[PDB]
């Protein structure tokens, strides 16, 4: 089931340690052996989020209550409530027209404020994922026939005492993909997505800041609440209903993504480095597969310009070397794009995951080699930050 | 043409790999060699963006038409219309005199409302350059007397095979310079421009999300439309003119940038790891040079902190390694800030770019040893986000 | 006073470089020794940040001036003033009672418009770090019984010529911690802080870009302004008072930092590659102290998920490993959340300072080994972009 390390993914110095580059990925998981010595596997197991921080709050569904109106007759001022200073209250100016029909002496218009108290009943939160919020738990193993290291940004490395091998580092590094300083966690009720950071910055919506607060003070209520025509005394102030229809609407695309409390799931990729005392590696060499694949599922699309292929084996020589190719929408090879670092099948009855990057327009995906081919057609759209909010 | 590996940048395993380290930047090209084999070249042939997203397009150009207007009597209540909840159009409510000369019983104010349709006629747009953007092509050639990788962010890695060196891995990354994280993609009509992204942000015209949608409808219209004074029945609306010249003038300083369709051009850097299999290299050595440099031509000032400096060598004793030298203010020589990775001198009549990053302030830079050194004084202003939209 | 390098952090090459690994950070300076060749230190000095560029500049303190109104008799038209198309002119429209009492024929709503000039007296700046305006000086020391490399994210090499050694590149980076794409400068009067970006930008004072201008222009200077209630020929507009107060509370807990005009110092961590001719170095190991620790100071928090702790040994066996351990609520070792690099006594009499990262929650932090050990426990709450500003 372990991919083994090949010998230029390793070198022993003449003095000094033994350095060994791995690519952990979730699923794969990757072996070596020393001279005379137990198989060493290493293994990503999870990939979590945890606790990150609120950017903004928004409201999707408000309430109203408390309306009041103070109204005053043409040659009697300004009107005025007191709740105008009250910021869990929104208020809004007018002059209506005022004459003997409704106590004044005069027809002109009269001053008229309306005050009501607005109310968040249903919100989303933006979060944003730093350094300290991600971790990465890696399972070392010695085959006498396990160690669970923890891997976060800020603390990459992990000293770890194996049997046989000794002290072994694991010196662990994210691999490029999801980008946590343009992509934000945003959570609507009991779902999460990974959205772009200025479209949630740029929703319309009322928004209050994601800091510290006794007092929730909500920005632009005007987005979700409606002053009716006012009367000589009196005036509706009405709301809008629940927003959470057009932001599932409007999140369409975007990655859903499981979180369980404060803590969110993904599937991580993790490049590292090992480093042991100096120590002679059996490296594994495998021959270009030579035989058939077939598609054990339709190619799925990442929204970071990834594809994920899965396919099975029909051929005799495994374990063996998966051969790869992109080409432009005219035939040029590109002699890169591939994102999967170990592309082996290790088990005919197994299907494998590769990850790949196509280039924007018109493309070809092609698995195995020969005329025993899979040749796939793509199209790849050019970068959104998503779907408008109406 | 190619600068000679040197036997630091290499390590050859006693068992294992070879691993080498290699800097490949626009114009330069790196050349090394093994135990009897032939010559091998590696250069970065070019790093292109494509299809960056639009954060948010701005409006510099408007137009107004069907200007409407309702205004009331005195008696008559508030002025409606329907256009009021309509987003192509910018309304304004306010009240007039009406009174005997203009239909009405009294003289008093009367209600009024203008509404008129807002229309984009040139926009720009500002557009994020994410890890799925950027592409480097990089060309290796064996010299029996070349295969071109493609290298992303995600796809950092090549693999490809090479007569009598075998197969070898490509694993490259993009020198620290350029940060697309905070500078943004400016495009207007047919130039594009370098800018900060909050300079952007915060820039004071209309504006509309980069979001997918079928209704394009903008937000601060009122930043080209005037409403000029009302009467009793109408009221005539006005839009700025074009703001192509003052955006021209605020863009002064920022950097220019080749734009063809959706693709964009860059003077890449990266910083490679070749593995291959063991093997002994044939490190190249080089003495300082210690003959006279000229400037080729005037010290040019990036926009991030560095200066290009290119110079030719008047000296005899090529291929050679220019000593190079960075002073504060007060003769301190600085010990680094010297960004070329490899200052040689290769082809005496082939000039040589170097870029640095000077201390602010007042500094010196020197190029050469001894008296035959070229020394020029250089001052560095503090960092700024750019000129303000006036 | 230095930590010796271990056999695991460099490889020798059967041909070309030795490669050596170190972290350095401030306090610690790390040593190693070649085959019969003079002792060698490594060491950072300081980390600064220069000249960084303002985002936005915010108002605290307004003043107030120039108090123009301009009103007009119910059948004499709005009011007007020039000051409206002064952008050092806040200005606000209304409708007022007029009269006899006040020289108008008709008792009505007049128009009236104020508008005074709005001064900021003192203001605070939010400035961003890039990578221009960072920069470390590593001391590197031959003893023969110093030289002073330059490092910066652009320029993150330096070749230097050693006695003994030869020529040896220091390619150095900075540790993963401090994350200047979320944090920002804030500056107001003599004190600095460390404040999230958004939770900055979403501060609610008046403002202005960090854009370069001839004519400083504030955006919502209503925040500090107050128009009183206007009288038939005269309005009263006031200022708030300074919101300094308001602001030292809002940025309780924030990290506080020393900045001498310019420049802003730093507590850095790099890690370093070291690339030397081949040479065998002599790697120095140490046995897991054995005796007790004594915490030295109370454990310190930082405001990005790590704490710092000081301890002193009380042991014999000095120079040691420090065991160090950290369990989660429910006494699972973690293996891993280190983030000091060489944990070493290298001194009994010096205390020793470490860093780690706690998961979020209920944890504990073990130093030593045995019943001997120190055991602490410790709470971490989930991350936050700082208070509300009220
Ligand atoms: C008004 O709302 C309720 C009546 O429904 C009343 O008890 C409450 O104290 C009032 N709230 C405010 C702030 O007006
Ligand atoms: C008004 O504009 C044109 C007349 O120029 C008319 O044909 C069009 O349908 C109207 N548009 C709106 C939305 O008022
Ligand atoms: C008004 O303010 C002062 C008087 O205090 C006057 O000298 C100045 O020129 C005026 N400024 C403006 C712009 O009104
Ligand atoms: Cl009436
Ligand atoms: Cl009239
Ligand atoms: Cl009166």
């Given at each position: 089931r372990c991919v083994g390390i090949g010998n230029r993914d390793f070198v022993e110095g003449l003095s000094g340690a033994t350095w060994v580059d791995v690519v952990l990925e979730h699923g794969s998981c990757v072996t070596t052996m020393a001279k005379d010595k137990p198989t060493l596997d290493i293994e990503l197991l999870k990939t979590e989020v945890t606790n990150p921080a609120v950017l903004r709050k928004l409201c999707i569904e408000a309430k109203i209550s408390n309306t009041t109106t103070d109204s005053r007759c043409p040659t009697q001022g300004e009107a005025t409530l007191v709740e105008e200073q009250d910021t869990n209250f929104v208020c809004r100016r007018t002059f209506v027209d005022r004459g003997?029909?409704?106590?004044?002496?005069?027809?002109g218009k009269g001053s008229l404020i309306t005050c009501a108290k607005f109310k968040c009943?249903?919100?989303?939160?933006?979060?944003?994922?730093?350094?300290?919020?991600?971790?990465?738990?890696?399972?070392?193993?010695?085959?006498?026939?396990?160690?669970?290291?923890?891997?976060?940004?800020?603390?990459?490395?992990?000293?770890?005492?194996?049997?046989?091998?000794?002290?072994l580092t694991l010196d662990c590094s994210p691999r490029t993909g999801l980008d946590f300083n343009e992509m934000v966690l945003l959570t609507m009720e009991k779902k999460s997505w990974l959205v772009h950071?200025?479209?949630?910055?740029?929703?319309?919506?009322?928004?209050?800041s994601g800091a510290s607060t006794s007092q929730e003070t909500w920005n632009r209520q005007d987005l979700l609440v409606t002053f009716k025509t006012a009367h000589a005394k009196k005036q509706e102030v009405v709301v809008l209903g629940s927003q959470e229809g057009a932001m599932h609407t409007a999140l369409t695309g975007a990655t859903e993504i499981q979180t369980?409390?404060?803590?969110?799931?993904?599937?991580?990729?993790?490049?590292?480095?090992?480093?042991?005392?100096?120590?002679?590696?059996?490296?594994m060499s495998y021959v270009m597969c030579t035989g058939s694949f077939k598609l054990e599922k339709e190619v799925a699309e990442t929204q970071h310009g990834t594809v994920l292929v899965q396919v099975k084996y029909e051929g005799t020589d495994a374990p063996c070397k998966i051969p790869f190719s992109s080409q432009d929408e005219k035939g040029v090879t590109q002699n890169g794009r591939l994102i999967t670092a170990n592309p082996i099948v290790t088990d005919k009855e197994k299907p494998v995951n590769?990850?790949?990057?196509?280039?924007?327009?018109?493309?070809?995906?092609?698995?195995?080699?020969?005329?025993?081919?899979?040749?796939?057609?793509?199209?790849?759209?050019?970068?959104?930050?998503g779907k408008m909010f109406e």
């Open positions: 003997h029909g409704n106590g004044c002496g005069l027809f009943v249903t919100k989303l939160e933006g979060k944003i994922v730093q350094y300290e919020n991600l971790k990465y738990s890696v399972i070392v193993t010695v085959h006498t026939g396990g160690t669970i290291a923890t891997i976060t940004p800020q603390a990459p490395t992990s000293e770890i005492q194996l049997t046989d091998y000794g002290a950071k200025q479209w949630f910055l740029d929703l319309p919506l009322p928004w209050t369980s409390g404060t803590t969110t799931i993904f599937a991580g990729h993790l490049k590292c480095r090992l480093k042991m005392d100096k120590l002679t590696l059996k490296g590769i990850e790949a990057e196509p280039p924007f327009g018109e493309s070809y995906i092609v698995v195995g080699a020969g005329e025993k081919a899979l040749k796939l057609s793509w199209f790849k759209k050019g970068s959104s930050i």
